[PDB]
Amino acid sequence: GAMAPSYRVKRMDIAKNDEECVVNAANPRGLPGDGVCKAVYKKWPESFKNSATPVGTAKTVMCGTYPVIHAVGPNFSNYTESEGDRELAAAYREVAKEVTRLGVNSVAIPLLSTGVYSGGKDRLTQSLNHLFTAMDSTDADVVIYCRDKEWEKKISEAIQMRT
Numbered sequence: 001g002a003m004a005p006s007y008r009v010k011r012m013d014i015a016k017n018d019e020e021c022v023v024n025a026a027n028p029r030g031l032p033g034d035g036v037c038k039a040v041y042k043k044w045p046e047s048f049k050n051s052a053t054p055v056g057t058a059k060t061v062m063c064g065t066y067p068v069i070h071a072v073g074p075n076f077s078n079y080t081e082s083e084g085d086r087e088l089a090a091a092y093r094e095v096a097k098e099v100t101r102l103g104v105n106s107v108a109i110p111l112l113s114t115g116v117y118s119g120g121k122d123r124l125t126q127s128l129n130h131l132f133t134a135m136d137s138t139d140a141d142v143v144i145y146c147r148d149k150e151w152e153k154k155i156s157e158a159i160q161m162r163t
């Protein structure tokens with residue numbers, strides 16, 4: 001575990017993370033995809049061998065010894081708000097299990113279902129609160145990666161508000 005487990009947020013490409021493993025905002029079919037998923041495919045393409053996994057689940061594949069945790073959030077274009085909310089919470093619970101199993105001291109994580117899978121809605125708070133629900137009982141240092149300047153400020157505020 002980390003000596004004083006923390007949450008942090010950085011505004012940069014999660015492919016450049018400084019953590020012991022990465023969570024991919026994966027599609028169910030293990031395809032290169034778009035956004036975070038394409039950056040992850042360019043950086044760790046070896047991790048997409050047999051990475052396909054259903055919605056609401058996480059599947060880890062090693063790139064050398066570097067673990068890539070493929071977490072499949074729901075696409076809110078296809079799911080009802082209710083069912084999508086349940087699957088988005090479940091994906092993060094499976095990320096917490098994998099992070100624990102791997103014995104890492106740190107993890108780089110994007111906000112699942114907030115980009116192309118958002119169904120055109122702002123899901124920062126929804127996705128971040130499910131991240132916290134899952135990760136709060138883990139002792140890894142969590143570093144959240146985002147690309148938007150206003151999202152960085154809002155994520156930072158939410159982290160600092162609970163300290």
Ligand SMILES: [Cl-]
Nearest residue numbers: 011012013016
């Ligand atoms: Cl960058």
Ligand SMILES: [Cl-]
Nearest residue numbers: 114115116117
């Ligand atoms: Cl997304």
Ligand SMILES: [Cl-]
Nearest residue numbers: 146147148151
């Ligand atoms: Cl963002």
